[PDB]
Amino acid sequence: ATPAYMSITGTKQGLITAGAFTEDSVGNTYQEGHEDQVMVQGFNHEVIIPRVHKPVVITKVFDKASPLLLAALTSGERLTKVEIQWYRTSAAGTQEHYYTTVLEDAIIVDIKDYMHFTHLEDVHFTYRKITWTHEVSGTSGSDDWRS
Amino acid sequence: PAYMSITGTKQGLITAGAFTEDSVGNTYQEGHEDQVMVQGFNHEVIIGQRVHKPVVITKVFDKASPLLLAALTSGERLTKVEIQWYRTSAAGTQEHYYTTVLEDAIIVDIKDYMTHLEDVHFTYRKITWTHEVSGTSGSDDWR
Amino acid sequence: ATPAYMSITGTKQGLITAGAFTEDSVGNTYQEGHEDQVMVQGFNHEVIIPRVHKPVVITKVFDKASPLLLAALTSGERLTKVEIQWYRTSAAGTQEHYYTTVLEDAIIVDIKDYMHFTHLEDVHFTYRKITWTHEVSGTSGSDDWRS
Amino acid sequence: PAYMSITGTKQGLITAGAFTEDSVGNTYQEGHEDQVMVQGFNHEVIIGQRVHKPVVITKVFDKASPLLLAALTSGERLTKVEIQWYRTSAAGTQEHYYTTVLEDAIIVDIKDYMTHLEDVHFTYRKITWTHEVSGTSGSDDWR
Amino acid sequence: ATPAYMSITGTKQGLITAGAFTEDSVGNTYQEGHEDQVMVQGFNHEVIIPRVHKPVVITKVFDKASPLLLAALTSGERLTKVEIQWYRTSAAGTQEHYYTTVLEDAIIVDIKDYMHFTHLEDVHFTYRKITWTHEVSGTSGSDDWRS
Amino acid sequence: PAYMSITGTKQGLITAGAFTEDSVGNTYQEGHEDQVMVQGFNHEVIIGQRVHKPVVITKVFDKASPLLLAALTSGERLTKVEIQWYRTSAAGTQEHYYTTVLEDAIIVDIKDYMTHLEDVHFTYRKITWTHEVSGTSGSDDWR
Numbered sequence: 055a056t057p058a059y060m061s062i063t064g065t066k067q068g069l070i071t072a073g074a075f076t077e078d079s080v081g082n083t084y085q086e087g088h089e090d091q092v093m094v095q096g097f098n099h100e101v102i103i104p105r106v107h108k109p110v111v112i113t114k115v116f117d118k119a120s121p122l123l124l125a126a127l128t129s130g131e132r133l134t135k136v137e138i139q140w141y142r143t144s145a146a147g148t149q150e151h152y153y154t155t156v157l158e159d160a161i162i163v164d165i166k167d168y169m170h171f172t173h174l175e176d177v178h179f180t181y182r183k184i185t186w187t188h189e190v191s192g193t194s195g196s197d198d199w200r201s
Numbered sequence: 202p203a204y205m206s207i208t209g210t211k212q213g214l215i216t217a218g219a220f221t222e223d224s225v226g227n228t229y230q231e232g233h234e235d236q237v238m239v240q241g242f243n244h245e246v247i248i249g250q251r252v253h254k255p256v257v258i259t260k261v262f263d264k265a266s267p268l269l270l271a272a273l274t275s276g277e278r279l280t281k282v283e284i285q286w287y288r289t290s291a292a293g294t295q296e297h298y299y300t301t302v303l304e305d306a307i308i309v310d311i312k313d314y315m316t317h318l319e320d321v322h323f324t325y326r327k328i329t330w331t332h333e334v335s336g337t338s339g340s341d342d343w344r
Numbered sequence: 345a346t347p348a349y350m351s352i353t354g355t356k357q358g359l360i361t362a363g364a365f366t367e368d369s370v371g372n373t374y375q376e377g378h379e380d381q382v383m384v385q386g387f388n389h390e391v392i393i394p395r396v397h398k399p400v401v402i403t404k405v406f407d408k409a410s411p412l413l414l415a416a417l418t419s420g421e422r423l424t425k426v427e428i429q430w431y432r433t434s435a436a437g438t439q440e441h442y443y444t445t446v447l448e449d450a451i452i453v454d455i456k457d458y459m460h461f462t463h464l465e466d467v468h469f470t471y472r473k474i475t476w477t478h479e480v481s482g483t484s485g486s487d488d489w490r491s
Numbered sequence: 492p493a494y495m496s497i498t499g500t501k502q503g504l505i506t507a508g509a510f511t512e513d514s515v516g517n518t519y520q521e522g523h524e525d526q527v528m529v530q531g532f533n534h535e536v537i538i539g540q541r542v543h544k545p546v547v548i549t550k551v552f553d554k555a556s557p558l559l560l561a562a563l564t565s566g567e568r569l570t571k572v573e574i575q576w577y578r579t580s581a582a583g584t585q586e587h588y589y590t591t592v593l594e595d596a597i598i599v600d601i602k603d604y605m606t607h608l609e610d611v612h613f614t615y616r617k618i619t620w621t622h623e624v625s626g627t628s629g630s631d632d633w634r
Numbered sequence: 635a636t637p638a639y640m641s642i643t644g645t646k647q648g649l650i651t652a653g654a655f656t657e658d659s660v661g662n663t664y665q666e667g668h669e670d671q672v673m674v675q676g677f678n679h680e681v682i683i684p685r686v687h688k689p690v691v692i693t694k695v696f697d698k699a700s701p702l703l704l705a706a707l708t709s710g711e712r713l714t715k716v717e718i719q720w721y722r723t724s725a726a727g728t729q730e731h732y733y734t735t736v737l738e739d740a741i742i743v744d745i746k747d748y749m750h751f752t753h754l755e756d757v758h759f760t761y762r763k764i765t766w767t768h769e770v771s772g773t774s775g776s777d778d779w780r781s
Numbered sequence: 782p783a784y785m786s787i788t789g790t791k792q793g794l795i796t797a798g799a800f801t802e803d804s805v806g807n808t809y810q811e812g813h814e815d816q817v818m819v820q821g822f823n824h825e826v827i828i829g830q831r832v833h834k835p836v837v838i839t840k841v842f843d844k845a846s847p848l849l850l851a852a853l854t855s856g857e858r859l860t861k862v863e864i865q866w867y868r869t870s871a872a873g874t875q876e877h878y879y880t881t882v883l884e885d886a887i888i889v890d891i892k893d894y895m896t897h898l899e900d901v902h903f904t905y906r907k908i909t910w911t912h913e914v915s916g917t918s919g920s921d922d923w924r
Contacts, residue, residue, distance in 0.1 A: 056316040077871035103309040118915030125919035145222035164827035190223040191264035195271040247454035291367035334368045335408030339415035346606040393599040435512035480513040481554035485561040537744035581657035625698030629705035636896040683889040725802035770803040771844035775851040
């Protein structure tokens with residue numbers, strides 16, 4: 055309904071989310087239109103003034119990317135771009151992309167696999183920079199990670 | 202429900218066009234175009250002289266969001282944060298019946314999370330409280 | 345149903361709950377019969393033997409008193425009388441006042457405004473003395489705050 | 492459900508007329524007029540010799556309440572706190588099937604809260620446990 | 635449905651669970667077939683490698699044994715055998731005993747009485763040894779308590 | 782759902798006949814006779830080089846259980862713990878689509894509790910992850 059979809063390009067692995075939202079990768083969960091992304095079912099992030107950024111935290115289900123993301127994590131591989139695309143039901147009753155969150159030069163700092171979409175997986179990124187854009191109303195803003 | 206307006210020293214009306222179709226999609230409801238909807242609030246004063254805590258508000262992702270996240274990373278002094286609270290009147294009509302206004306508030310924390318929500322904390326220099334229908338009010342400097 | 349209603353008289357402000365449970369003050373929540381009180385939707389208090397009293401803690405919704413109570417709190421104003429009246433459904437099927445809790449020379453020590461009756465507000469009083477009376481059965485007892 | 496009786500050294504039967512119309516309004520149920528209804532219980536013994544914990548009971552606001560709050564602020568030694576537990580018998584009838592009796596119990600904490608409830612803690616000198624239908628029993632000094 | 639039943643034999647008291655699951659002892663809860671046991675409605679236990687055993691923890695309702703178990707606890711009485719019998723719905727639709735847990739030379743280390751089967755009671759045993767047996771498939775294993 | 786196989790150095794296939802009528806009664810489902818059903822999983826890797834956490838799995842009481850509790854009290858090195866994850870395929874059929882395999886895993890904690898459940902923790906020397914339908918994989922030494 056109002057899910058996010060994500061893409062990862064790793065310096066070593068290329069597009070990590072390639073063919074990752076497909077019948078093969080997700081099975082009965084598959085919906086067309088986002089075949090080279092991953093279906094984000096979670097999100098948490100926080101910037102505070104004691105600025106200090108906190109790691110970005112997404113949640114997905116087990117998939118084609120998953121074994122790759124671990125490789126990423128355990129390898130210490132810099133992620134050239136992680137880009138989170140936000141979706142909503144528009145005012146005219148159609149699904150639309152209306153917000154973007156984007157990491158530049160991100161690094162995966164931890165992963166947790168757990169069963170509760172019953173097969174789950176949270177992934178955490180730090181990054182050198184993050185950009186928030188509103189896609190319909192045209193507002194945008196970005197910033198450099200601190201601490 | 203509540204609607205909030207934020208005017209900052211750099212950006213002006215940060216909440217301009219923030220409750221429109223473009224901003225919040227299907228959730229749009231005419232009448233509060235230059236206000237962000239607030240559906241969560243937290244604030245506290247505790248007692249020897251009183252000390253203040255930050256006002257926390259929860260909103261959804263909208264046009265204001267990136268501006269807000271800017272207001273926080275910049276350190277921009279919010280001239281006015283104004284929260285108008287609505288309720289169903291005794292006669293059966295939505296009415297604006299309360300305001301909580303912060304002067305020179307600052308954003309000291311923002312938490313985004315997932316439907317797609319975002320918490321905002323402000324400290325400030327002065328808070329005002331007014332009951333619009335019964336005509337009572339009070340205010341206090343931050344400490 | 346089984347709500348409490350309260351009255352506050354402040355040394356400086358007089359009857360703080362005056363006209364505070366009315367259409368103007370509470371809106372659609374209004375029920376006649378308690379116009380000069382406030383509708384208490386919460387209560388917590390505790391006396392212990394390590395006697396030591398703990399602050400009295402009520403909960404209400406935003407109202408006509410609310411901006412006043414803050415004035416009280418931030419002013420350090422001594423409350424001459426806070427009096428909490430307890431209501432229940434009687435044995436004959438009618439609502440009745442059957443219990444009273446009363447503070448003498450109370451002081452408001454903290455307030456919390458929060459949205460969950462969706463607009464809420466907890467208020468805490470210390471006091472020099474508190475009296476508990478059962479109104480139908482005639483039992484009563486009082487005591488001086490300690491610590 | 493459970494019903495409790497408390498006789499104190501100063502007041503006598505603190506729970507006299509405590510489960511009547513006057514005391515608990517609509518919730519009244521004949522048969523236990525000189526007992527307060529208990530709908531919450533907590534107690535523990537843990538093990539080198541055993542130590543005791545206070546018996547906690549939860550009741551509603553009633554005629555006993557102010558007397559109880561007195562018993563605590565006075566320090567009055569409760570000669571007897573007696574808790575009789577009821578259940579539905581195998582034949583389909585409410586029956587008294589268990590007792591927990593404290594001797595020289597003391598009230599060491601009371602928590603009132605809101606439908607309108609109140610927790611009571613007792614320490615004591617001796618607790619007895621008896622199963623009324625199966626005819627088993629035990630008891631122990633506080634330590 | 636899938637309850638456990640237990641037996642206790644104490645060095646001093648003999649069979650502590652004798653006549654303890656009966657009309658007299660449990661009232662309307664009574665089901666025939668386990669008259670000399672107790673109806674276990676809880677269970678918790680854990681063995682870890684920092685081996686170190688943790689106390690065995692069962693839950694029952696108030697009953698004929700209960701005043702006895704306290705005697706046991708407060709007396710420091712060694713329990714010659716506590717034996718927990720596990721029940722399930724078989725593949726052919728009939729209730730069966732399929733697992734056993736058994737303590738040798740156990741000691742009751744604490745009891746908690748509490749009201750939530752509304753009248754409840756958790757009991758904790760340490761022990762010199764515990765044996766786990768699967769009754770249909772024939773697997774078994776035992777061990778000595780450590781720490 | 783998931784099914785797990787465990788081969789140990791002393792016992793061989795610890796999960797042999799562990800998902801049969803004899804083992805799990807009414808819950809039996811043909812096709813995975815030498816696998817224990819896993820209906821709960823927890824595992825984590827966190828980041829300067831990576832460190833591993835134990836894989837936790839939850840199962841019911843079954844034929845494997847006492848063997849498992851032995852594997853823990855003995856200290857027996859598990860040659861292979863293999864977890865195959867199933868899902869409903871896009872075409873509407875249960876399919877094995879993922880594996881998590883531990884090499885030389887050790888049981889470092891077991892928690893039994895009540896319908897009748899049991900948690901197992903393994904540390905290990907090497908974990909592998911493979912996506913069976915999309916053909917991706919990774920693995921890592923414990924640290």
